[PDB]
Design a protein around this nucleic acid. Structure first.
Ligand code: MG
Ligand code: MG
Ligand code: MG
Ligand code: MG
Ligand code: MG
Ligand code: MG
Lengths: 51, 149, 77, 117, 190
RNA sequence: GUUUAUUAAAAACACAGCACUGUGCAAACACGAAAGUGGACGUAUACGGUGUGACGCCUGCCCGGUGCCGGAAGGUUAAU
RNA sequence: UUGAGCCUUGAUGUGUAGGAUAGGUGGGAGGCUUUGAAGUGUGGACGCCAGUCUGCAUGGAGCCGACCUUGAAAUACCACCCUUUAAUGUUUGAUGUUCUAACGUUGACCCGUAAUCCGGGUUGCGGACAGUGUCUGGUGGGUAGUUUGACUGGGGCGGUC
C-alpha cells in the first residue's frame, strides 16, 4: 500500500499492490452484490483446492 | 448643511472651521453633543469677532512673554554675596529661588520657577551661567557671579 | 392624527388621473415621522411628530424657536 | 504566482477514465488533467496511453509552480493507474514515495446489481 | 498644450517622418471615408514628387514641369504592360475614364487634373504638397505632416489640417489630432 | 346531523377520514385609512386556505396549453 | 474593495505560386543595442498542448530592402490600433465590513401608579436595515363603472352593411 523506496532506483517496485487491494477486494465489491452464491462460488474454491 | 465646528472633530473638523456636513450627522450626533453648530450667519460673524481677538492680540502679548528676555541680556549679570572656603570655592551656593529671587528683586522680574540652573546648581565661586524661562521656546541666557564678600 | 407639529401639514385630497384621465379621489399624506430632539436648553428629549419638511424648519429656525412657537399657541410638547 | 517544490500527484484511475490531479502536501489543488481532457473518447480514453498523455499535460500546468519532488497516491483500478506514474517519473521528476488509497468498505453499502450482457 | 508643443521632437537623423493620424466617428447609419484631391496642407513642407499622369503625345514638354518628374506616354499605355516589377499619379477627365490603364488585379493614385486648354496652367498650384487618406479599417486620415525643418511653423497644418472636420457619422465624437515617429510618440488634443 | 321561515328534506350542505398548500409567531390570515383586535393567552402533533368525503380494494399515462413554483446570463423595460 | 462607463503604460493573426504562423492600409530606402542582443536553460503564462512573449538570465558583437512571385511585402523602425483580452486609476455608486447615534423592539426593569393602557427613565436586543411619505414599473374581477351594433317574412344561427 505504501512504498518509501529511498535513493537509487526509478523502477516503481510496488508489487505490493498485487498482494491485497486492486482486483482483490475491488473486483469483488465492484458489482453484483452476491448474497448466497458466494457460498456456491467458494464451494468451488475448495471443490478445486482439495486437489 | 454648513455648520461651524466646536471641538477638533475627526476626519473633517478643525476646532472652529466652516465645514459642510450631512444633516443626519449634524442633528443626531454633532450639535447635540455640542461638537458643532448651525451656520446661521448670525453665528458665522459671532465667529468673525472670534477671528480677530484672542489670536492677533494675545500673541504679541507672548511677544511680551519673550521681550522680558530683551532685559535678560541687557544686564546679563547679578552677583550673589556668597564667600569661599579654602580656595575661591563658594562658602554659599545659589539655585532657582536664589537666581529667581535674586533676579526678581531688581528690575528683572521673573517667576521663581523660571530659572534653570541645571544643578551647578551649584558648587563653587565666580562666574557661572543659567537658562532663564518665560516662554516655551524663548528663554534666554545671563551670567551669574557669586561674589565672595 | 397625521399632522406635522411644525408646519401643520396634514393630508390633502386630490385626484388620481389615469392615462384615460379618469379621476378617482385620493389623498396625499405628509412624510410624518416621530423624532426625538435634544433640547439643550432643557436637558431633555422632546419628541415631535414632524414632517421631513418639518425637520428642515427645525434645522434652520432651531428647536428652541420652533418649540417656542408650539408654546406660544399652547401646542403642548 | 506562488511556489512549492515538495508536492503530491493524485490520480483517480477508474475503468472509464483516469484523472491526474497535482497538489501540494496540504492537498490544495495545483493543477489537473484528464484522459478525456486531452482527446480520445469511448474506449480511447479508458486506456493507459490516454492516461499517459494526461499525466503529461498535467506537468505542463504544475511545472508552473516549479515542483521538484512529489509523492504519488493511486486510487481505483483501470489503466493509467501505473502508466501515469511512468509519464510522471520521466516528465522531469524526483518521485518520492508511492501509496495506494483505493477505498475499501468493511462491507457497507450494497453495490449495484446486474450486468446481464 | 493649448495647441501643440510643436517642440515635440528633440535622434533618428531627420525627424520629418511624421503623420496626420486623427480620429473620426463610427458608421452607425451611412457615412464613408474619402479624401478630396491632393490635399496640399498650408505648408511648403518640401516635397518633390514624380507625378504620373496619362496625357498624350503633346503633354511631354510642359505637362511635366509643375511639381512632378514625368508623365506616362502614348506608346506606353500597354507597351509598359509586360511585368509587375517594371510597372502621385493621374487620369484626365471630362468624359474620359481609365479602367483601360488602372483597373482589376492594389494601389491608390487618383488626383492629377483635367484641362482643355493647358498642360501647365497660369494659376494651378497645390498638387505636389501632401498625400491622400481614404478608408482603412478602424478609421481614416493616414498620411504625412510637418518636419525637422520648421518649429511651430509646420503648425500651419494645425489650423488648416485638423480643420478638415466634415460632417461626422452619427453617434460618434470625431476629434483627436496626433503625429510623430522616430524618437517617442504622442499628440495633444482637439 | 343540516337545508330553501311560506310549493323543493333531497342524491344537495355538513360530517369523521384523506391530500395538497400556506404559516418561525409582532405567524399566515381576517376586521380595521389608523390605534387596536381576532387567530391564541395557541406555537408546526399548531393555526389558516383549498379540494375529496366512513370504510374496503385502489387511485395509471400527459407539464403542450393555463395557472402556480424556481432561475440567473442575456435581451426588453419605469421614475430618476 | 466587486460588475460598468472610458484613458495613459503593452499584446496579437497555420487563404496558393514562397527563404515563411502576410491584420487593413500609411510615414519608409537605415534605425539602432554597448542606456550592454540573436537563442541555447528554466521561471509567470494566454492555449485550436500549432506556437508565441519577456522583468531576469547563460549569452558577447550584426541582421538585412526594391531582390524572381502575389488582387496586398517586410518581424527594417514607427503608430491611429480593429479580431478580443489583460495590469493601476477616477470617483462613483455597487455588492461588501464594522460602528451607534436617527429609527424598531408585540425582552427585562424603574417611576408617575394599588394600572397587561399610555408617558418618561434604565437596560438588553436589533439598526441606518426594517418601516412609513412622495414618485414610479409590474400585478390586481378583490372592488367599481360601462360596453357588448343594425337589417331580419318573430328572434337567433347564417348572410348582409
Ligand atoms: Mg318551503
Ligand atoms: Mg316539503
Ligand atoms: Mg389543517
Ligand atoms: Mg363532493
Ligand atoms: Mg364587474
Ligand atoms: Mg334588431
Amino acid at each position: 500500500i505504501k512504498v518509501r523506496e529511498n535513493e537509487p532506483f526509478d523502477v516503481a517496485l510496488r508489487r505490493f499492490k498485487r498482494s491485497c487491494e486492486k482486483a482483490g477486494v475491488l473486483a469483488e465489491v465492484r458489482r453484483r452484490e452476491f448474497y448466497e452464491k458466494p457460498t456456491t462460488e467458494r464451494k468451488r474454491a475448495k471443490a478445486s483446492a482439495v486437489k | 448643511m454648513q455648520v461651524i465646528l466646536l471641538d477638533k472633530v475627526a476626519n473633517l473638523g478643525s476646532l472652529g472651521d466652516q465645514v459642510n456636513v450631512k444633516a443626519g450627522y449634524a442633528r443626531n450626533f454633532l450639535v447635540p453633543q455640542g461638537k458643532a453648530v448651525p451656520a446661521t450667519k448670525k453665528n458665522i460673524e459671532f465667529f468673525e469677532a472670534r477671528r480677530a481677538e484672542l489670536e492677533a492680540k494675545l500673541a504679541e502679548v507672548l511677544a511680551a512673554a519673550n521681550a522680558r528676555a530683551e532685559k535678560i541680556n541687557a544686564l546679563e549679570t547679578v552677583t550673589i554675596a556668597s564667600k569661599a572656603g579654602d580656595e575661591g570655592k563658594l562658602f554659599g551656593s545659589i539655585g532657582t529661588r536664589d537666581i529667581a529671587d535674586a533676579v526678581t528683586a531688581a528690575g528683572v522680574e521673573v517667576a521663581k520657577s523660571e530659572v534653570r540652573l541645571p544643578n551647578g546648581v551649584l558648587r563653587t565661586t565666580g562666574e557661572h551661567e543659567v537658562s532663564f524661562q518665560v516662554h516655551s521656546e524663548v528663554f534666554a541666557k545671563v551670567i551669574v557671579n557669586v561674589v565672595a564678600e | 392624527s397625521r399632522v406635522c407639529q411644525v408646519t401643520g401639514k396634514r393630508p390633502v385630497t386630490g385626484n388620481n388621473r389615469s392615462h384615460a384621465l379618469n379621476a378617482t379621489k385620493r389623498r396625499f399624506l405628509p412624510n410624518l415621522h416621530s423624532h426625538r430632539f435634544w433640547v439643550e436648553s432643557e436637558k431633555r428629549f422632546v419628541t415631535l411628530r414632524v414632517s421631513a419638511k418639518g425637520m428642515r424648519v427645525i434645522d434652520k429656525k432651531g428647536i428652541d424657536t420652533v418649540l417656542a412657537e408650539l408654546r406660544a399657541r399652547g401646542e403642548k410638547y | 504566482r506562488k511556489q512549492v517544490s515538495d508536492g503530491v500527484a493524485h490520480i483517480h484511475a477508474s475503468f472509464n477514465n483516469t484523472i491526474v490531479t497535482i497538489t501540494d502536501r496540504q492537498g490544495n489543488a495545483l493543477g489537473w488533467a484528464t484522459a478525456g481532457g486531452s482527446g480520445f473518447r469511448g474506449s480511447r480514453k479508458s486506456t493507459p496511453f490516454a492516461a499517459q498523455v494526461a499525466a503529461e499535460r498535467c506537468a505542463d500546468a504544475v511545472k508552473e509552480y516549479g515542483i521538484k519532488n512529489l509523492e504519488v497516491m493511486v486510487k481505483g483500478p483501470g489503466p493509467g493507474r501505473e502508466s501515469t506514474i511512468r509519464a510522471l517519473n520521466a516528465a522531469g521528476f524526483r518521485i518520492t514515495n508511492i501509496t495506494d488509497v483505493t477505498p475499501i468498505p468493511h462491507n457497507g453499502c450494497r453495490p449495484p446489481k446486474k450486468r446481464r450482457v | 498644450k493649448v495647441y501643440t508643443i510643436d517642440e515635440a521632437a528633440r535622434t533618428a537623423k531627420f525627424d520629418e517622418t511624421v503623420e496626420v493620424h486623427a480620429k473620426l466617428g463610427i458608421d452607425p447609419r451611412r457615412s464613408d471615408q474619402n479624401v478630396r484631391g491632393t490635399v496640399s496642407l498650408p505648408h511648403g513642407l518640401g516635397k518633390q514628387v514624380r507625378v504620373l499622369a496619362i496625357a498624350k503625345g503633346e503633354k511631354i514638354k510642359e505637362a511635366e514641369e509643375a511639381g512632378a518628374d514625368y508623365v506616362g506616354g502614348e506608346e506606353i499605355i500597354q507597351k509598359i504592360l509586360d511585368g509587375w516589377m517594371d510597372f502621385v499619379m493621374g487620369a484626365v477627365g471630362s468624359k474620359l475614364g481609365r479602367i483601360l490603364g488602372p483597373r482589376g488585379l492594389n494601389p491608390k493614385a487618383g488626383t492629377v487634373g483635367f484641362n482643355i486648354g493647358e498642360i501647365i496652367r497660369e494659376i494651378k498650384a497645390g498638387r505636389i504638397e501632401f498625400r491622400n487618406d481614404k478608408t482603412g479599417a478602424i478609421h481614416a486620415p493616414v498620411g504625412k505632416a510637418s518636419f525637422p525643418p520648421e518649429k511651430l511653423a509646420d503648425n500651419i497644418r494645425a489650423f488648416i489640417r485638423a480643420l478638415e472636420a466634415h460632417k461626422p457619422e452619427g453617434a460618434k465624437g470625431t476629434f483627436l489630432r496626433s503625429v510623430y515617429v522616430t524618437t517617442t510618440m504622442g499628440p495633444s488634443v482637439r
